[PDB]
Design a protein around this ligand. Structure first.
Ligand SMILES: C[n+]1cn([C@@H]2O[C@H](COP(=O)(O)OP(=O)(O)OP(=O)(O)O)[C@@H](O)[C@H]2O)c2nc(N)[nH]c(=O)c21
Ligand SMILES: C[n+]1cn([C@@H]2O[C@H](COP(=O)(O)OP(=O)(O)OP(=O)(O)O)[C@@H](O)[C@H]2O)c2nc(N)[nH]c(=O)c21
Ligand SMILES: C[n+]1cn([C@@H]2O[C@H](COP(=O)(O)OP(=O)(O)OP(=O)(O)O)[C@@H](O)[C@H]2O)c2nc(N)[nH]c(=O)c21
Ligand SMILES: Nc1ncnc2c1ncn2[C@@H]1O[C@H](CSCC[C@H](N)C(=O)O)[C@@H](O)[C@H]1O
Ligand SMILES: Nc1ncnc2c1ncn2[C@@H]1O[C@H](CSCC[C@H](N)C(=O)O)[C@@H](O)[C@H]1O
Ligand SMILES: Nc1ncnc2c1ncn2[C@@H]1O[C@H](CSCC[C@H](N)C(=O)O)[C@@H](O)[C@H]1O
Ligand SMILES: [Mg+2]
Ligand SMILES: [Mg+2]
Ligand SMILES: [Mg+2]
Ligand SMILES: [Zn+2]
Ligand SMILES: [Zn+2]
Ligand SMILES: [Zn+2]
Lengths: 451, 451, 451
């Protein structure tokens, strides 16, 4: 009846968890000092909900699985495991160890069958078994009706979904960090409730952002090099830090999962699909996708995000490896603070006065993490100013003055308040869509572990 | 005896719901975190009331139905389902699944007959059954006495009503968002109690409205393009966001449902009709229409709206894709705030002082959503000013000075106070009024689901 | 069920210990006045956790052991003991004494076997026994599955790990002081919670750092020596003081244990490895390393540190042997103090006012040790100033001005706030990897002690 999560009983994240999963009874039971506890707790509850939603005797494809996390479940999982990351062999060895440990003490689960399939696959690397295989997403041959993607950021979404659809899958789920900041094309950012920071590779030698390192210096004027940098814009490669765990990512693949409300997959067979967000908690989301044969209706190409807390994007000035530059940074702000700043932002306010007001509101325990307070205070200060200028240059209704050129105004802050929506135009019609990789020493090690 | 709605027990919308449905006992019972909960609750109670109002052994046509929502009812529904939207196939599959799940556990409803009709229709796409068919509103052949339209915005109202009338229907209902803002021809707007925002397609790159997105820039003066925009007025296509769900709409079809108090349908057969509003709650309404054979009385062509809370329309200045422009926006204001601003608006007040007074009245929990407070403060400030000028240029009774031209004055705010009425002139006499579309893969899928 | 540590019942370090080991019940029981009690307590709890984590019937290699600390354990240890430090013979004699004392009173442990192996090794210095040998890390011949390094700072990490891996070891642990300050290349520093200070050999005659000594003088202007010092930068040799115990160290070997998240060992056999931090307490850490045969994935070469309290590096001015100079110093600051200085650092503050505010916050018992307060007050004062200048010289978005030279700015303070991360680039692919030393008088002494 109750669900247990490994967090401190005094934490303030438990209230947000209980608000996001009202159909469960959430109890804290802390056993480790893990520095990314909140993310693990959210993922655990998400899988509980998804299992509650679907029916038994249905076969489930787990794309890019970590098998040891599915071993005590009663449903029917087929784990797809290619070996492409440096962390995979340790996960496989953990699976074998946990299988061997519990082999005559637990008899409610297909333990003997799981062991048999693991040994069979170790014998011949190119066979499909009910519970385990060694292919990718586009070369597995098992047929199923449901697919699950959990923290998978390394595939192009439409191609992968088409290859699941032609095999009979009608329903899919995706669990992960919200993709909205990468649609606005920010240079660096934070997910403060989850102790997570991310940055573009070009700014890792900055000074005052969440993820960076630099040195002391006295400052020399020469630095004479004939190269022309002259231009600093975002590039493909990005670095993520979740607590103290590091992961590299690609902007193109992250953007590909920011799907519109309805879309068409037009291949040899054809499908009509829709995508909607069913859980949203302070930057972490769950998405549900359904797919149907044939072509119906028409598409517009728009994707919408609903903001329950505030979302901010702003321009900032820093030194990178000693040289002063400007670039854009993004973050999330709790709704109670946003509501309490409404009156103050009616006038022009300096950054230093906004900082003191925010500190006054925060400290009572803290509602929001202190290291982001300065950059927020700057952004609010600019936003207010840009509103006043708008009211002081009033235009005539229904008319654009384009004397034959028109001027563009400055914009240094974007601020989405609680209960507003972002909307962006993306592609909505798609028509353009194996070697073993295992080694004998690892096979011998796994065989030895099982026996 | 009590009705259950999926909302939080602490919400302030429950008081308004209880006020709008005094004949029921409304109890909150929350099971999901749905971000458009209030709209779903209002629709559920509306259907309960309509069923209470009419008598059994009457056959009901459900136009543009979602059949799974009618499956546990005891009345006799005929669901009209063409397949014209990208969301329809998923709704059909949900219907088949829910039918198969409950087939020997529920015996108070025509479950076996419903399954039989679904299979019969899948066999031959061009047959009418008691419970289900695949035609449009103007090509269904079933005869009935009542018709229901629930959240249907895609048909021209007089043509549809005439085609129901010539089949013997004498009573119809319509449930939906209030059409008044589109009669005033606003560019964008909000329904704040339902977490809903809407906008014209031409202003989706604005900065400070409910539904928009834009970018950071430094501002270049060139932007040299020889096109002459020169003119910015509303056009047909509009976008709606209900929580995080997106829907496109057409202005012409929305205006067509803003019907006068009495009207005539003059075809081969003739009818006399009247329309009145029976439920009104913070922007959501229920309308009741009766139709009778023959021609009686005379028409004027006026349609009236009664305001229980305040309604505002005003001019605002923003930047769209970097360029500064002006346009009109509309919203609703709670009656207690309107009553508490009566004394302050007797003098000239600046926008910045009005904003601080409104914040003082709001925060005690919030009576009204904070993101609309600035634009309201501006509107009130203009309205007061325009009243003072009127009192300072007094005319003579019963005389128009038209020396031979007359001048028109500025008008930047329209404000309808609680207990006033809007009135508009519209048309009141009308005299000017099929392929399958299903696919074999979907038919096979549905057949498989039923078995 | 409870674990006992030799600390005062009134100490404030017990709360931090209980926070870092939530799976235990920690009770204070003081028996000695030891001036490095906190470090010993942390090491004791770390070994308890590691033993809890792994399974029995596994053989454990203890690299650079002190055997008397393993004698009352139930697991199977093989202690590797070369004789390379001046403290080793006393540890060996203590082992022999404690073995002889308990030889018929304790029968749950392999006491008789331990004595037999000690005598056998004393007889022939070049034999391996289950419990004891006299080789180094790269010349021991025993085969095992787990390795442990406890307070070992004298080996090059990749070479040592490769030599364990080719013998079948799959899992290793490392316990020690955090290596982050030596990656930033500081000249001197402190670990204040553990009563520990360290310094470069060139600054041991300073005046106001943690570890130093100097003299009184009147000051003569001559000091004429023709040598050109002219340049003061860190060199390899460093001195550590833990309470009143002194240890010399090498910068190269300390840096070698600051390992990236994944790496490859490419020799005659090949391995893929990953490293992560599982316990972190105010400057003391535990690291866990896993190794697998074969080559999988790809590497980036980045190492990340997560900051739960604040970390500071700053420039300071002192006199060394009478001559005034400047150099860099580093330290740790508790999170509550950092959070309480957020509002004050929005403006420019002098060092003398920051010192008085910090004293006000500290004294209530002390949260932080007083001897570091002046140097912290200076650092904060500089950091604030450098932030203001950044906001006063704003650049254009996306552009570097390199008119053809660019200027570098001054940087006198680096400040990592709670919940941020450091990231550094290090090597991630490695492909480049005995005499007795005992004496007859010592052998005779040990033989006499055993009998
Ligand atoms: C695989 N993966 C996981 N995460 C997140 O980072 C956290 C670490 O995920 P993990 O896979 O490193 O956790 P592990 O299986 O080692 O078990 P644990 O250490 O006991 O939790 C997870 O909680 C995820 O939310 C991830 N985040 C990003 N950006 N990219 C990834 O590939 C990725
Ligand atoms: C079909 N439709 C529904 N709405 C409103 O938008 C909401 C979403 O309606 P929905 O049909 O998307 O809800 P669904 O059937 O998926 O079930 P739910 O997600 O569990 O509620 C409804 O509550 C309606 O009030 C709609 N609003 C507009 N503007 N246009 C539409 O066509 C339309
Ligand atoms: C062997 N060693 C130990 N330490 C730390 O310094 C402390 C003294 O370690 P110790 O080995 O001198 O303690 P001893 O075995 O004499 O027993 P005790 O005096 O009763 O505790 C330990 O608690 C370690 O944390 C050490 N610190 C450094 N820098 N270098 C070392 O080689 C080293
Ligand atoms: N094309 C592909 N098809 C299937 N899996 C892939 C893939 N490309 C990468 N992967 C796998 O995706 C995994 C992501 S990390 C593992 C995430 C896992 N589901 C969890 O919950 O912890 C990696 O193990 C990697 O091997
Ligand atoms: N001309 C027409 N006649 C009947 N239905 C139509 C129609 N044009 C569109 N529709 C249908 O109207 C529906 C509107 S969305 C479905 C609303 C449904 N009554 C509910 O309560 O959820 C779509 O399914 C669409 O297929
Ligand atoms: N190459 C090497 N291989 C194994 N041990 C070594 C070594 N070089 C130095 N050592 C040993 O490492 C020890 C470090 S001091 C002893 C630390 C001990 N593990 C404890 O907990 O107290 C010294 O005794 C020294 O003899
Ligand atoms: Mg981990
Ligand atoms: Mg929905
Ligand atoms: Mg000692
Ligand atoms: Zn497979
Ligand atoms: Zn019909
Ligand atoms: Zn040995």
């Amino acid at each position: 009846d109750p669900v247990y999560v490994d967090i401190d009983a005094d934490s303030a994240f438990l209230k947000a968890l209980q608000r996001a999963y009202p159909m469960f009874e959430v109890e804290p039971r802390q056993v480790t000092p893990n520095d990314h506890a909140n993310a693990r707790a959210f993922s655990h509850l998400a899988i509980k909900l998804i299992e509650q939603e679907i029916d038994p005797d249905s076969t489930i494809l787990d794309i890019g699985s970590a098998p040891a996390r599915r071993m005590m479940s009663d449903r029917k999982y087929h784990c797809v495991c290619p070996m492409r990351s440096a962390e995979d062999p340790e996960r496989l060895a953990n699976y074998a160890r946990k299988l061997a440990s519990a082999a005559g003490k637990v008899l409610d689960r297909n333990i003997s069958g799981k062991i048999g399939d693991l040994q069979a696959v170790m014998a011949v690397p190119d066979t499909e078994t009910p519970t385990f295989c060694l292919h990718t997403d586009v070369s597995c041959r098992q047929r199923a009706d449901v697919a699950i993607y959990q923290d998978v950021y390394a595939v192009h979404a439409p191609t992968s979904l088409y290859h699941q659809a032609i095999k009979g899958v009608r329903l899919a789920y995706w669990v992960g960090f919200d993709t909205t900041p990468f649609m606005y094309n920010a240079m660096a950012g934070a997910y403060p409730s989850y102790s997570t920071n991310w940055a573009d590779e070009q700014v890792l030698k900055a000074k005052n952002i969440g993820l960076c390192s630099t040195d002391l210096t006295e400052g020399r004027r020469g630095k004479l090099s004939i190269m022309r940098g002259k231009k600093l814009e975002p590039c493909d490669r990005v670095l993520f830090s979740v607590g103290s765990t590091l992961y590299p990512e690609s902007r193109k693949l992250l953007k590909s999962w920011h799907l519109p409300s309805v879309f068409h997959l037009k291949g040899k067979l054809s499908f009509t699909c829709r995508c909607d967000t069913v859980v949203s908690c302070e930057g972490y989301v769950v998405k549900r996708i359904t797919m149907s044969p044939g072509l119906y209706g028409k598409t517009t190409g728009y994707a919408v995000t609903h903001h329950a807390d505030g979302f901010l994007m702003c321009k900032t000035t820093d030194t990178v490896d000693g040289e002063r530059v400007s670039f854009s940074v993004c973050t999330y702000v709790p709704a109670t603070i946003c509501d309490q700043m409404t009156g103050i932002l009616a006038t022009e306010v300096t950054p230093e006065d906004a900082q003191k007001l925010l500190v006054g509101l925060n400290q009572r325990t803290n509602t929001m993490k202190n290291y982001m307070i300065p950059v927020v205070a700057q952004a609010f200060s600019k936003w207010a100013k840009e509103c006043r200028k708008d009211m002081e240059d009033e235009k005539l209704l229904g008319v654009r003055e384009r004397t034959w050129a028109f001027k563009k105004q400055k914009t240094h802050t974007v601020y989405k308040r609680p209960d507003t929506q972002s909307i962006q135009k993306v592609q909505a019609e798609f028509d353009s869509f194996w070697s073993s990789g295992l080694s004998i020493p690892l096979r011998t090690r796994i065989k030895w572990l099982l026996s």
